[PDB]
Amino acid sequence: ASYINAAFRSSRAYEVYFFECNKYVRVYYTPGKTDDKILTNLRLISSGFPSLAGTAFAEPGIDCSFDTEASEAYVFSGSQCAYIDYAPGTTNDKILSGPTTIAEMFPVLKNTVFEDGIDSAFRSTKGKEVYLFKGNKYGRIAYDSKQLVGTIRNITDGFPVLKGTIFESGIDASFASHKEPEAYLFKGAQYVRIKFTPGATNNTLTGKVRPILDGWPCLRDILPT
Numbered sequence: 001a002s003y004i005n006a007a008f009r010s011s012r013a014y015e016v017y018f019f020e021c022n023k024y025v026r027v028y029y030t031p032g033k034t035d036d037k038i039l040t041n042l043r044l045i046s047s048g049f050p051s052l053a054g055t056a057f058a059e060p061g062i063d064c065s066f067d068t069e070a071s072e073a074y075v076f077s078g079s080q081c082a083y084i085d086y087a088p089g090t091t092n093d094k095i096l097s098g099p100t101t102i103a104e105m106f107p108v109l110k111n112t113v114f115e116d117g118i119d120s121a122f123r124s125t126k127g128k129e130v131y132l133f134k135g136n137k138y139g140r141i142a143y144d145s146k147q148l149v150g151t152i153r154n155i156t157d158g159f160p161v162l163k164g165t166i167f168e169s170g171i172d173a174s175f176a177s178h179k180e181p182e183a184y185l186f187k188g189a190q191y192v193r194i195k196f197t198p199g200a201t202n203n204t205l206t207g208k209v210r211p212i213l214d215g216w217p218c219l220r221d222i223l224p225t
Helices: none
Strands: 006-009 015-020 023-028 037-044 064-067 072-077 080-085 094-101 120-123 129-134 137-142 147-154 173-176 182-187 190-195 204-211
Touching: 006 072, 006 120, 015 173, 064 173, 120 182
Parallel strands: 006 064, 006 173, 064 120, 120 173
Antiparallel strands: 006 015, 015 023, 023 037, 064 072, 072 080, 080 094, 120 129, 129 137, 137 147, 173 182, 182 190, 190 204
């Protein structure tokens, strides 16, 4: 069974987009409570985002994503990526850059562990940084300069709080919360909420590692796939 393959934080307060294969939902979420609700019922990506129809991002779907600023996000499908405006509340979504390869979008990533795919990503509170995860490795990109910030290390070199959890070996999906500096990390059937600390190993777990459907019961009729 499969769960969440990608996520990103909307410009709209307390909205999140979740991608599952070739489909997605938009959820109005509630930190610390099982009061999340669906705003967009399970829909093909190609329907929600006609700009993506006929691309890898629609079929087989989006396998990594992150929000940047405004109503912009990067989306990924295998080695391909695109910069989009997801234009909430309208039909004005559009591709701003690409589709192209990861290495062409972000030349600093050419020849790195990220060039053939990214597993997960989320927006940092530090500047324009975005966390990138691939296997048990992670780095940070500043989206606006496209600079790799530092080096690509083990997840637990940045996030020792995740030692002894399955997240130490990789993350399937993630997004930054509207409640800063929290983030949600997903791995198969499970998730955890963290408070992250850029440049420090002061990150905390907010609660326990638990099944997604326990914390997000509004998803129980659509997951797993």
